[model samples]
Target: SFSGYLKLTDNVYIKNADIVEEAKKVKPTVVVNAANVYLKHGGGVAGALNKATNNAMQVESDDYIATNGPLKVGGSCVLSGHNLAKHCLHVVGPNVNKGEDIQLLKSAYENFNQHEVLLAPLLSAGIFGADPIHSLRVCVDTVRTNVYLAVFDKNLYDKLVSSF
Candidate 1:
């Protein structure tokens, strides 16, 4: 587990922690999960987030998809929070299996700007295949307030620290 954080700005931080656990805090934060365009909750951070919400997020996700269709890359859909957070923002990241674009990833991070207190994993950097350093930079650059980067990988956390 991550012990502390690296402050990127007065309001943004990067740390090694579990996003689900962080969301359970009384601080009333939003949790952002990197999701597929279909909003299906699969393995990795997505799995954990969905499980923490008691599989209820999948229900909301399916309902949203049935109504709105699939979310476009970099687009997001918000859902009611459970015991985990005040809300959950599921974002579609550009998958490297298709193609890699930092621009799309940056836009995904932009979705978090409106949230006051946010706990997020590295969007697009997991199964989506965006590089950890690039994802970290975009996350650090886009978010401007009370954002915590809940990176669970120690190697990535070390890389993030060593870079600065």
Candidate 2:
């Protein structure tokens, strides 16, 4: 069973796990949320994160937008982690239907690299319509050391271990 980790390099890895569950296990880590420009925790990873953090994420996201304005595509912001990791990094990925630019996706991944030990979801691959393979491709190329790209879906996990 390929249920643990896949090495992307000598240091980086792709973890086949749930971000929520993994975040609880790892101390002093940052969880990356695939968020919209508005930073609303309507569904997907964002919603789960909000739920795990006792809805504090939603209120924090609201205040962030209220104060700093909405994040642009490929842009990101970090917030204090209420009950999970040390920080929650919110990044806006590109809508695949817009064009063929995966640069935005690449940019989104790059933002989380500055932090130590990242627990990230595959951005733009779920509701946003970007192909998971494409999203994984960007992650494979840009993800830094000590980062774990959390793959929750079983099928995607299969693809991750097989293809990467």
Candidate 3:
């Protein structure tokens, strides 16, 4: 298990809106989205990221995020020159298994070794059905550079704003 002790020196901001909406508004330098193992570039927020980048992320997903077996949470694939941002990151987070909600979040964030204003999402919220509010400190503990966590839930978004 990845302990939430990673050193982070990043500026993380919590934004309230769909990832696509936030992307268009801020135009971050990098877009980071939660990914599962299936390599289906036609679904979820990943799908929006794909269409925004003109289907450029599919090759990276096949070669990197979905190679061998499922990515073990810490695995990531970073691509560049996407439509919305200069770069994009596809980081494999946890699935909706028996006991993954808490365990996999650590990896969702640990992959960002260093960055410059990367836009991210609340991993597992939609597909995996994980609670949005239960994932603040760990996410903040992993990033090593400026990050933007665009959340889809309004209540959770409000909580993050006041907590930090």
Tell me how many clashing residue pairs each candidate has. 0, 0, 0
lDDT of 1: 0.79
| lDDT of each residue in 50-96, candidate 1, tens digit only | 99888999898999889989988988988877777778888887888
Off by over 4 Å in 1: 1-3, 25-27
For model 1 the TM-score comes to: 0.90
Q: Can you give the lDDT of residue 78 in candidate 2?
A: 90
Listed per candidate, the RMSD to the true structure in angstroms reads: 2.4, 2.7, 6.4
lDDT of each: 0.79, 0.80, 0.66
CA error at residue 61 for candidate 3, angstroms: 3.0
My TM-score estimates for the predictions, one after another, are 0.90, 0.89, 0.74
- Compute the lDDT for candidate 2: 0.80
Please provide, for model 3 over 80-156, each residue's C-alpha lDDT reduced to its tens digit, 9 standing for 90 to 100. Answer: 63657667777777666545656767777777656655778877666666666556677777666666677777787
Q: 2 or 3, which is superior by TM-score? A: 2
* Winner by TM-score: 1
Q: Write down the lDDT that model 3 would get.
A: 0.66
Q: Quote the lDDT for 101 in model 1.
A: 65
Q: List the residue pairs that clash in candidate 3.
A: none
**Between prediction 2 and prediction 3, which has the larger lDDT?**
2
Sliding window of 10 residues with minimal summed lDDT for model 3: 1-10
Candidate 2 colliding pairs: none
Clash pairs detected, candidate 1: none
